[PDB]
């Protein structure tokens, strides 16, 4: 209906609680493996944030996997930074990690992150 | 880190995608039964929005149930309105549904919704 009222902080409060569930390992249903590192997460949050995970978990066979192995070129710290961004809206972008974050965001199909990485790199040229 | 940048629309965009997954029945993992009506949802979104579902799905036995039956006094339309609010931040509050929405929000432990229902009722007294 068009007569709805809206609670401004709702989406942010939901994301905060999803991050609290992730921190406590509650109802996490997939482990993402990035070389030697493992990251537990919720498939729905991954799909909601990434074109790659949206494609993976809508596949009729991959939707049922409990472990997903990423390409060995993917940097675990870059993945960790992006996983934290998925669950908090905050991206820890630094001179020392920007190339890895951008490469990981291109692989994960997270265009908005790729765009801000490109802008930050271009400003330092 | 304290040097993060933030994408303002991220939380809202995540919630929009969770609602699209719900509409398409993708990765839904529980059916909530409210008298004769059934509602498919994601357990993590329910927990992130409701004190009752947070308690239910953190219980070591109930976390594994695929069906949850609500109290027979709960109005299905009231539940539907609140489930839509969980997934969109929009509450379809109307003169004809406010008492049922408020009763359902009290049962679901959604205080912010209870508070706005009380304010709207008080304004019409």
């Amino acid at each position: 209906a068009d007569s709805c009222i809206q609670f401004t902080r709702h989406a942010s409060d939901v994301l905060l609680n999803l991050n609290r569930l992730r921190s406590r390992d509650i109802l996490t249903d997939v482990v993402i493996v990035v070389s030697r590192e493992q990251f537990r997460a919720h498939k729905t949050v991954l799909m909601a944030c990434s074109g790659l995970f949206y494609s993976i978990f809508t596949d009729q066979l991959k939707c049922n996997l409990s472990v997903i192995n990423l390409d060995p070129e993917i940097n675990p710290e870059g993945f960790c930074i992006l996983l934290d961004f998925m669950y908090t809206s905050r991206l820890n972008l630094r001179e020392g990690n920007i190339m890895a974050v951008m490469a990981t965001a291109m692989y994960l199909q997270m265009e908005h992150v790729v765009d801000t990485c490109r802008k930050f790199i271009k400003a330092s040229e | 880190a304290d040097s993060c940048i933030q994408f303002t629309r991220h939380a809202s965009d995540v919630l929009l995608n969770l609602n699209r997954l719900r509409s398409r029945d993708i990765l839904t993992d529980v059916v909530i039964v409210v008298s004769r009506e059934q509602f498919r949802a994601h357990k993590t979104v329910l927990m992130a929005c409701s004190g009752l579902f947070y308690s239910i799905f953190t219980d070591q036995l109930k976390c594994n149930l695929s069906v949850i039956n609500l109290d027979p006094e709960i109005n299905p339309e009231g539940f539907c309105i609140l489930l839509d609010f969980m997934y969109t931040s929009r509450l379809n509050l109307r003169e004809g549904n406010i008492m049922a929405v408020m009763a359902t929000a009290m049962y679901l432990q959604m205080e912010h919704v209870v508070d706005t229902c009380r304010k709207f009722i008080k304004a019409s007294e």
Binding site: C4, I5, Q6, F7, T8 | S89, R90, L91, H112, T116
Partner: peptide, 5 residues
């Protein structure tokens, strides 16, 4: 909070 969206 609440607003008219």
């Amino acid at each position: 909070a609440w607003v008219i969206p």
